[PDB]
């Protein structure tokens, strides 16, 4: 129902210790990247946020992260979900710590929110108060600065991004032009923490507005 | 069943009255683009044709138009369909005029056509007699020149395009190599209105022939 | 169930006997490519392997070969499957021979293999003893050399590729980074025939290992969280 949280799920987790040189080459790993932590989940943007959180908690880097075409509901195999993330670190210890931080964040109550009665429109509006090394790089902003991470389906996202930009003193850093691999859209916005928060609130209200009246113009 | 029209549906329409400058920057809008019209539907190629029609009825430009991966049948949310289109114009009234023309066209009886008994193969074979500003740019031709807009599933499209090019006095402008986002394929062909119609008929006939004999190649 | 073969199916096959110049241009065909053979099927990597086998049987080149977004189980039309392949040759007779070889290979018993009880995880671990002109060009090796053709879903593939590279004297030629259009991943590895076989064996074992215990990490390392 409307305002219900859609719980994200982790599907599989594995560690690679002493990664093969051939694989290290193709992933373009650094010399201190000896171990990899692999994760898949059924919700990509929650996982991207959680991987960023991991870079704060442990000496890991996000070296690979991609979404699956047409999203988790169209997965053809059990563990594909709609995202794969790869953390790299100096040892299995640091990679396990990074994976533990990722898992803790994914279970923390964050997620997409339903905008209607059968949960067929949903959105993500997450304020990241202090970015780690992954989302700051993706947005092109300085490490440690705040972001608003806003995602909705294509039309809702375009309409609601406009409302979010008018509601607060925020800049658009990165535009997820529709379609993303999962057929969503959105953006990463930056500004002060309170402005990002304001942007999140306005974004959520605007998506809900479209959901309640999709054809009115 | 065979030759039935598959009716396209509009899922959502919105107008942004005064677009924020941050948005205008990322969409690379021109300074006179003040208002946006947004539309989603469950059929991309009909919608692209309709958006082109809107540019003939009003002073609007198509500034954004993209298809969704794996098509409307695989949509995960209610309003995503398989296409988003964005019109831009100098005012909300002009954008409204453009969207009305888009909706009327989508409702006019155009659409994909079934090639078989359970509608599991379908194609689009549409003669655009006078292109607007969107399809003419896309195809690289003068505004007002004719197009055949031909779309089918991947093998059918390759086979039927060859037939259409042989049957009719037409040139290939743009090739949609398989897969498009929706896992279709096709092309835009130009020529006289008469030749584009003949290309449409030959394309339709060839798609039907593949549907009726999908494994036959020894003759 | 586990170790069952998943049978691949051909959906459509056609020949264009004399290709139009307009189409020849867009496909960037060679001057001696006069005829095209078209094929779709519900399994892409088996079909790519079969197309390579065709280049050994007839005077044909693979000029086009692409997978469909989100795979065959999400196809919206009957004949799209998850792959289209296009063979080109100098005459309909050669294309005809190439397509027959392609069909025969697809029916030969090769395929993806199930990794678990409900066939919800599957993988391809195929030892190509003697590459034709298509896979050799793709991998950057000489025609006739061996390949290990390894495909699985994204996390399984990454884990199992590492196992395969450590199991034998093989080199990574081509890496299919996740996701491919079908949301799989994998690689082409080369080495001697026996090394490619060992790599196939280790890959298959590693995929099965993940399938039977995808979240063991939780018990072992996420305790008291
Ligand atoms: Na589906």
UniProtKB/TrEMBL annotation, chain B:
Key word Cell membrane present: no
Domain BMC circularly permuted: 1-110, 111-217
Principal location: other
Coiled coil: none
Keyword Repeat tagged: no
Family annotation (InterPro entries): BMC_CP (IPR044870), BMC_dom (IPR000249), CcmK-like_sf (IPR037233), EutL (IPR030983), EutL_PduB (IPR009193)
Cellular component annotations (GO), alphabetically ordered: bacterial microcompartment
Location of this chain's protein in the cell: Bacterial microcompartment
Keyword set, alphabetical order: Bacterial microcompartment
Record-linked Pfam families: BMC
The protein, known as: Ethanolamine utilization protein EutL
Species annotation: Clostridium perfringens E str. JGS1987
């Amino acid at each position: 129902m409307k305002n219900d949280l859609i719980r994200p799920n982790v599907l599989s987790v594995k560690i690679i210790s002493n990664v093969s040189p051939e694989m290290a080459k193709k992933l373009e790993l650094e010399p201190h990247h000896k171990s990899l932590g692999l994760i898949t989940a059924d919700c990509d943007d929650v996982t991207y946020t959680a991987l960023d959180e991991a870079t704060k908690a442990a000496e890991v880097d996000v070296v690979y992260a991609r979404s699956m075409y047409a999203g988790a509901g169209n997965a053809s195999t059990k563990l594909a979900g709609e995202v794969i993330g790869i953390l790299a670190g100096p040892s299995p210890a640091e990679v396990r710590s990074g994976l533990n931080a990722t898992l803790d964040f994914i279970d923390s109550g964050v997620g997409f929110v339903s905008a209607n009665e059968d949960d067929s429109i949903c959105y993500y509006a997450q304020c990241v108060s202090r970015t780690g090394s992954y989302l700051s790089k993706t947005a092109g902003i300085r490490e440690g600065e705040a972001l608003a991470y806003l995602v909705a389906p294509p039309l809702e996202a375009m309409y609601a991004l406009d409302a979010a930009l008018k509601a607060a003193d925020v800049e658009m850093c990165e535009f997820f032009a529709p379609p993303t691999e999962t057929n969503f859209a959105g953006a990463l916005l930056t500004g002060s923490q309170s402005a990002c928060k304001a942007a999140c609130d306005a974004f959520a209200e605007a998506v809900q507005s479209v959901a309640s009246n999709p054809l009115g113009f």
